[PDB]
Amino acid sequence: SMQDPIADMLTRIRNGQAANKAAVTMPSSKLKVAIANVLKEEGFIEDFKVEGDTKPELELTLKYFQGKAVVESIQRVSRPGLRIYKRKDELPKVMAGLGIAVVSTSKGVMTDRAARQAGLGGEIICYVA
Amino acid sequence: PVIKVRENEPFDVALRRFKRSCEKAGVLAEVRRREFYEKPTTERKRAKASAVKRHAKKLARENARRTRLY
């Protein structure tokens, strides 16, 4: 009964890439906004818009390189049945460093290489590939 | 059922009226049904198989039969 909304955001993204949709809407959240911001930095989406007042929604404009989708695959890692925490030297490398591992560490949400350069580990959220 | 023969009528036409009326009323079919008891599994399977066979005839006739053969 909606135990993970972050995984729901990732599932909406993945079904939007597979179904060739342009923009994906969802209910919004602060962690969803931070994750979508990290995707917008690394270039897996190209925009994200929040609108509502007490009932906010979030629209991600998906990215397509000429035929296919930019996100080859996305996966959820620290699901609420198994929360995965990694130290700063055990931080994961996705696709040998061509995909980002979004980690919410003690200063905020960032990527894997941002955590390795900033020098601190945290909670992994997803593998974006 | 009851077939009143009108005056000055041929007998075979009144017999044809009777046979048509018993064919519409469904007499021999309902009597042929009630000779042997069928289990309700057999009745529901006969109903389901009749419906699937009817719609497999119709889905064949409506689009898989409209093309030319030769």
Next chain:
Amino acid sequence: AVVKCKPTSPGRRHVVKVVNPELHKGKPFAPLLEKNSKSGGRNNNGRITTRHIGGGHKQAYRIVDFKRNKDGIPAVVERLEYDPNRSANIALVLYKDGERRYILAPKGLKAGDQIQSGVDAAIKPGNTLPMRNIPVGSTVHNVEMKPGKGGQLARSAGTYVQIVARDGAYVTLRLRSGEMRKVEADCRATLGEVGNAEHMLRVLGKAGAARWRGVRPTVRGTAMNPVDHPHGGGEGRNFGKHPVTPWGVQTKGKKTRSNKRTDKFIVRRRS
């Protein structure tokens, strides 16, 4: 209801009793009591005419109104009483003017129920009507066999009689044994079914229970000697004869109704 006893003794082990809470706990109405001397099954020549009768708890006779002559006058059920002389329970009934009478209790009948006899009363269970104004199909009890005679059929606990047909002067009833019998339609009947219908379920547990119900032990004819019974005799359990009454009349199948003067009122034989 039906209460089974706990096996704290063998005679207490096999007992099922009928506990009735609505029976009035007290002494009976002494204006309606007579004394009841026992017999032992012995007639005025003092000889045993009905065997296996004798002993038992002393019991006083309660005058049960069977006739229901007080017509067109209402009557309120006062209480339910235990009758020892009977299978059913009796109901003390107070008429509007002051007279109290015992009646047979119907099935649905508790204290406060207004009952009424007559030819006009109602069709509630408890009212007494002649079987001219009782509908065909209704369940009656305390049926008369002659007009004004008093009421003989359907009088044990849980028993009743169905009015099957009406034809002219006569009413064809179906008795509790399945026999269809004719009565005159001016015979009265009380509507409903006799109560205490859970009477048949008590299983009495011990020999002393049947001994204080007044019943005395049955010796089988095979156990006796050839002088005493036709069955008697043998070196170690021989029977070899057709089963008979102790006076040598065939039992176990043989019919013995020989009236010829009430055969006209019989529609079907018992079956």
Next chain:
Amino acid sequence: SLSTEATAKIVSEFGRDANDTGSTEVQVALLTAQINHLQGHFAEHKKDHHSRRGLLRMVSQRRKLLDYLKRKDVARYTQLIERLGLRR
């Protein structure tokens, strides 16, 4: 099935006003009143298993609402359990 004037009598006995029909106290009192009426119903008929499933749904729902009210506010909870006559 708890007709309208009886529900109005309970709503304007437990509610913040007549337009308040959805508090925990109003809902528990309506469920309790219907439970008592159906307790009248299930004294007879004794084998209505489907209506008894409907009753058991509303009994478990009253238990869940009362457990919420117990965790939320013990003072209103204890006042309601002395008012309505349920032991726990």
Next chain:
Amino acid sequence: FCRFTAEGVQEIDYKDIATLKNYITESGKIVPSRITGTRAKYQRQLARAIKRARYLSLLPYTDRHQ
């Protein structure tokens, strides 16, 4: 086509046995909805009213019976 929508009735009444006599066959059977074209809920109301009018002897059950 359905005629109970075409008139626009809300409940088929059991009393007017002209309509119920129209919707039965000659033998007393209820005529199937696939040939009269009545919609579903009015066919259920039709069977209900035909059975109720059958009870009150306003319609025969079978044509044959003594």
Next chain:
Amino acid sequence: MRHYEIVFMVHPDQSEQVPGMIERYTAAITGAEGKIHRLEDWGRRQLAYPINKLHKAHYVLMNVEAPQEVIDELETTFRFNDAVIRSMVMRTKHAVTEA
């Protein structure tokens, strides 16, 4: 107060007693609380099957808005009355006005 339709059929040889019967039936109901919304005395017509080997019964129709127990008493009345040969009682949603 629910709205019942009552159709009861009387013998033809006892059709002359139908009005006064109707009167005490109205006296059965209008005394307590209940109202008559229609009294459509149909009259005598031929049956579709021989109920009790007889035809041509007298159909009476009446609509009541009534409490329930007086209608149960009316059904007990239609039970033991010998004039009737069939009586259906029905619980409708609204009252009915015309004939």
Next chain:
RNA sequence: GCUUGAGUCUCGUAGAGGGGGGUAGAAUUCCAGGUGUAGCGGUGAAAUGCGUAGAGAUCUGGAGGAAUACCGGUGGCGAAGGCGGCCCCCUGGACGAAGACUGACGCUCAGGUGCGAAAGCGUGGGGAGCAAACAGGAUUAGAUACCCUGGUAGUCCACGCCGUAAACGAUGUCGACUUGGAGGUUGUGCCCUUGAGGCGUGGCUUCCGGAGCUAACGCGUUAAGUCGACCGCCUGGGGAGUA
């Protein structure tokens, strides 16, 4: 704190949802009588069986018991098992329009508890038809089977017990997302009802198929697609769901 999840009220709908009671009509059997006669019944073919003590056929009257033809629908309702004449009384759930109220009260669930087809058990009734067992006649090498003529328990009711089925869409429950087409069923909103209409919007449901998945068959917005939460289960066949 808030209202999106969940719930409550107002109002209407459809329904073999359940429980109790009553009533109607056809048919089978039995019982009684009328007419009337040498067959009936049955089979692949016969025979057992019934009939000159009057069968079967037909008419009238009655007695009971059980199931509800037509409607009847790849309809509907229910958590499942399951529920079919009609009417009344008590009663459960679902769903739709427009609002208002509480404010995360939610999802799943080991153990536990309840419901749970048919058969079966216990007690008390009831017993028409059907019918295990049983008997006879056949077929056959044999036939403790199919077939025929009979026929008890049982099927029905009140109350308890049993607790299993190919209890099956062999597909756990809940939530989200992801092209379509033709139907059915049941609400509601609008356009000129201008016309057996056009337009949307919800619930439930049957068929075909796209991407995707799949060992394949096939599933395919009601997933067996993409995911999340919790539970149950599996580890070669047999022995064995046995001791």
